[PDB]
Ligand binder design. Structure first.
Ligand SMILES: Nc1ncnc2c1ncn2[C@@H]1O[C@H](COP(=O)(O)OP(=O)(O)O)[C@@H](O)[C@H]1O
Ligand SMILES: Nc1ncnc2c1ncn2[C@@H]1O[C@H](COP(=O)(O)OP(=O)(O)O)[C@@H](O)[C@H]1O
Lengths: 73, 407, 49, 371
């Protein structure tokens, strides 16, 4: 299940290729990187903290979770 | 009674004839056979081709280009390998044919080629040389109006506040961005139009499209509702991409009640697919990624029926009500409709307006037309107040149209 | 680089000791033969060749 | 083209004389045709389009002479357009002839797709005329004023500044001649006739209803002067079906400018019609088709029995009399069954008693129920 470039007539593999998922799938990823600050959200501070501790903290550290032994959400 | 024995039909069709029968049926068979002989003799009719006027075309340039250029195939680009950026290599997809690894031509440049991008390619080496525009679905691109309707805001009667508030959003920021930017305000980007049928909502949409000066796309409920799943959502994706291509654009949904129906689940899944399409729309209007300079107009006869997320401000910021016209509005629309006709100068229109019950503007145009037919059926070249009163009577009594349940 | 690929395909009824029916992948089926030296008893309907 | 209409129907030598006149003319056609250049233009163009030429579909036009074309294998090709191709005749979805070797666009092919609506284009109105209908004079003037006069003479309305009426509903008990009147007006003004029967626009597929009505209006406006007939609108008229209603209502009233296509909609249950579809703005002409009265019934009897051989004793008045109990279709049924009854007893000349027992038996089969 690998992507390889072969000879157009003799079909001999003469290149390996990076796996291509789909054009749409490549469209889904974010490249513009929007700029809305957390301070721009008002009143939702508790929910913001919930989402941050659920998502960002597993990204940044992974040590405070493993030191406990928890599976991050 | 015994059935018709062969002798009985024989005598039936023999004794009862005139002394002409044989001649005229034989002559009719000759009609048919001579027609067929004429048809076979003239041959079939030439169906022909294009072939614009003869003096217009050809030149040896045609054949020279035919024998000199290349019939490029079209391929989806993908995954610029960019292994060393001195020769990047690309992947191409020839639909239902193959997938290739290729390079650019001596003409095109790496900056000219992006991922996807729907490039063109030669037919035997499959080297890439042409920048082609992306595939817009034809049933989405014909949706662009391409022709302004012959209606202006002056043709809309009575709804001064409605037209003012709608022009504040769909026309003013495009015409005068300076007012908003120098005051530092963000204008609304979504206007919903609601009211009873025949009050002029589609007329206001026509006026906006005539005065828009930007890219205006009409949208109808039937267009979005495909049969196959996700296809309507796909078309709305392409429609919003098309709107993004234009430097600002106006999107009009007529009778969004066709798709915006509130989500329900317990009906064995319900319509669902229409809900999925309106969900893709509800995301496109405001989801991830800013919408852009896309101002959007919806008109519907059932404002309450649409899903609450669609009513939500930020996607539908300003909601406008077209109620049944008042007496002044009825007079104004009667004037507007009577502008085009050949009528008496002394038609006291406000009388006709106060004879009118709670009649929509469609009723006003209908009664004006009925006066037109009264005048024409009378062959008179001037419509008179008597014609207008008969038209009022006809229209009103027709709309009114045992009934012993009354009092 | 001089090597040339070979078309894969499943086989079908053998008509004789030499001629077989092979269903070349998703493509059409052909009447072909064993080269000279391969087995003959092992080639039964359903052998990838 | 078609033959002239010979208008004696009794077997008389006038009918003969008209016939042999027609035979004379067709025989001159035969004579003339039997009693029997641009090689430069052909040698350039029809040799540039070297045979054979493939048939494909045009998707987009990019440059003045460059366009994208797909073919039946599904591949996509950016090809050039030779100058002789009429650009204005080219649009997305158009069938295009292509050079076999280099796929270059070499001309537009007249459309042969969209089969179903191509069939319902019928255009086969000429079986009837205003002649075939008798006594529906008020209805005739109404529909003439609404749809026929604007097509034949839009000059009156344009001079008056009037935008012509843009919708007609016909209603009444069945067999009163609504379909006949629609076909007759289609015959009087030779504008293309479109007929679609009610429930047939209701479809299992979610899109097929609104899609079908959209394509029918598309083909109607493509034919330009056209009349579209929806009989038994009640089937749709009285979410998905309501969405087809919304599509039809917006195709009538909504965006864009419709132009010249006229709409006739026939219903048997007008009072059950939903308020939306009966638009005062669009549907300003509602034409009732009452059960025929004595004069109208007499006219229908004469029209239908005209082609039948009749005896002297037939007193049409006793057939006409009593009340407005029946319609024109029932009258045709009486005429037909009287013909059969005369045939059984071996009359090729139907008599009064034949019609008497015919009307009696029809009234027997007319309605039912325990006392
Ligand atoms: N206030 C008005 N001024 C002028 N014309 C009007 C007015 N209201 C209605 N009309 C006429 O009646 C028709 C109303 O259609 P409209 O209400 O726009 O359809 P919809 O209800 O589907 O939006 C228009 O074609 C217009 O000519
Ligand atoms: N006024 C009339 N003149 C002649 N024929 C009529 C008349 N009314 C009804 N008919 C007969 O009835 C049939 C048409 O019925 P119609 O009312 O048009 O059907 P529908 O109710 O489906 O519209 C025709 O065959 C026609 O011969």
């Amino acid at each position: 299940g690998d992507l390889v470039g072969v000879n157009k007539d003799s079909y001999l593999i003469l290149e390996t290729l990076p796996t291509e998922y789909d054009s749409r799938v490549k469209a889904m990823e974010v490249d513009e990187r929007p700029t809305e600050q957390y301070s721009d959200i008002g009143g939702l501070d508790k929910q913001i903290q919930e989402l941050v501790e659920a998502i960002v903290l597993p990204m940044n550290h992974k040590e405070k979770f493993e030191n406990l032994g928890i599976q991050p959400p | 009674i015994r059935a018709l024995d062969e002798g009985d039909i024989a005598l039936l069709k023999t004794y009862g004839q005139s002394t002409y029968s044989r001649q005229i049926k034989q002559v009719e068979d000759d009609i048919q056979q001579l027609l067929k002989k004429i048809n076979e003799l003239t041959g079939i009719k030439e169906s022909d081709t294009g072939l614009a006027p003869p003096a217009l075309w050809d030149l040896a340039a045609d054949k020279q280009t035919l024998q000199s250029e290349q019939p490029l195939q079209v391929a989806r680009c993908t995954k610029i390998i960019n292994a060393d950026s001195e020769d990047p290599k690309y992947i191409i997809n020839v639909k239902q044919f193959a997938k290739f690894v290729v390079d650019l031509s001596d003409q095109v440049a790496p900056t000219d080629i992006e991922e996807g991008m729907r490039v063109g390619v030669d037919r035997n080496k499959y080297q890439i040389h042409i920048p082609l525009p992306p595939k817009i679905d034809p049933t989405v691109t014909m949706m662009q109006v391409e022709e302004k309707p012959d209606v202006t805001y002056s043709d809309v009667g009575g709804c001064k506040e409605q037209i003012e508030k709608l022009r504040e959003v769909v026309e003013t920021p495009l015409l005068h961005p300076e007012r908003f930017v120098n005051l530092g305000i963000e204008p609304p980007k979504g206007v919903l139009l609601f009211g009873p049928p025949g009050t002029g909502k589609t007329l206001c949409a026509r006026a906006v499209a005539n005065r828009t000066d930007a890219c205006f796309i009409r949208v109808i409920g039937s267009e979005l509702v495909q049969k196959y799943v996700g296809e309507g959502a796909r078309m709305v994706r392409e429609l919003f991409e098309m709107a993004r291509t234009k430097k600002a654009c106006l999107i009009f949904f007529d009778e969004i009640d066709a798709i915006g129906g509130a989500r329900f689940d317990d009906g064995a899944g319900g319509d669902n697919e229409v809900q999925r399409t309106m969900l893709e729309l509800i995301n496109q209007l405001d989801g991830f990624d800013p919408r852009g300079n896309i101002k959007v107009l919806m008109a519907t006869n059932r404002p309450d029926t649409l899903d609450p997320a669609l009513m939500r401000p930020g996607r539908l910021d300003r909601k406008i009500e077209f109620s049944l016209p008042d007496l002044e509005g009825r007079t104004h629309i009667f004037k507007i409709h009577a502008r085009s006709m050949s009528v008496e100068r002394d038609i006291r229109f406000e009388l006709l307006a106060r004879l009118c019950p709670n009649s929509t503007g469609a009723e006003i145009r209908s009664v004006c037309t009925e006066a037109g037919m009264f005048a024409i059926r009378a062959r008179r070249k001037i419509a008179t107040e008597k014609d207008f009163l008969e038209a009022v009577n006809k229209v009103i009594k027709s709309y009114a149209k045992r009934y012993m349940t009354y009092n | 680089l001089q090597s040339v690929g070979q078309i894969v395909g499943e086989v079908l009824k053998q008509l004789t000791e030499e001629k077989f029916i092979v269903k070349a992948t998703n493509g059409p089926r052909y009447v072909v033969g064993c080269r000279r030296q391969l087995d003959k008893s092992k080639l039964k309907p359903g052998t990838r060749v | 083209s078609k033959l002239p209409l010979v208008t004696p129907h009794t077997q008389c030598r006038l009918k003969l004389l008209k016939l042999e006149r027609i035979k004379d003319y067709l025989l001159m056609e035969e004579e003339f045709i039997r009693n029997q250049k641009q090689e430069e233009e052909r040698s350039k163009v029809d040799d540039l389009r070297g045979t054979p030429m493939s048939v494909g579909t045009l998707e987009e036009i990019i440059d003045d002479n460059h366009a994208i074309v797909s073919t039946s294998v599904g591949s996509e090709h950016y090809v050039s357009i030779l100058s002789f191709v009429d650009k204005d005749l080219l649009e997305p979805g158009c069938s295009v002839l292509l050079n076999h070797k280099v796929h270059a666009v070499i001309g537009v092919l007249m459309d042969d797709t969209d089969p179903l609506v191509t069939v319902m284009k019928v255009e086969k109105a000429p079986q009837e005329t205003y002649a075939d209908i008798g006594g529906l004079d008020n209805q005739i003037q109404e529909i003439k004023e609404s749809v026929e006069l604007p097509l034949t003479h839009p000059e009156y309305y344009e001079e008056m500044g009037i935008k012509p009426p843009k919708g007609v509903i016909l209603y009444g008990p069945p067999g009163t001649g609504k379909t006949l009147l629609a076909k007759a007006v289609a015959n009087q003004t030779s504008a293309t006739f479109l007929r679609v029967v009610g429930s047939e626009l209701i479809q299992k597929y979610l899109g097929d209803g609104p899609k079908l009505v959209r394509e029918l209006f598309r083909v109607a406006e493509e034919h330009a002067p056209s009349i579209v007939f929806i009989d038994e609108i009640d089937a749709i008229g009285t979410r998905e079906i309501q969405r087809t209603m919304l599509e039809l209502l917006n195709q009538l009233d909504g965006f864009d400018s419709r132009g010249d296509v006229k709409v006739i909609m026939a219903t048997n249950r007008i009072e059950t019609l939903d308020p939306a579809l009966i638009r005062p703005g669009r549907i300003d002409r509602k034409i009732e088709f009452p059960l025929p009265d004595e004069k109208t019934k007499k006219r229908i009897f004469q029209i239908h029995t005209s082609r039948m051989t009749l005896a002297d004793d037939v007193t049409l008045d006793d057939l006409i009399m009593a009340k407005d109990d029946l319609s024109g279709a029932d009258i045709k049924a009486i005429c037909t069954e009287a013909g059969l009854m005369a045939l059984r007893e071996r009359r090729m000349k139907v008599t009064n008693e034949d019609f008497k027992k015919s009307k009696e038996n029809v009234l027997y089969k007319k309605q039912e129920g325990t006392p």
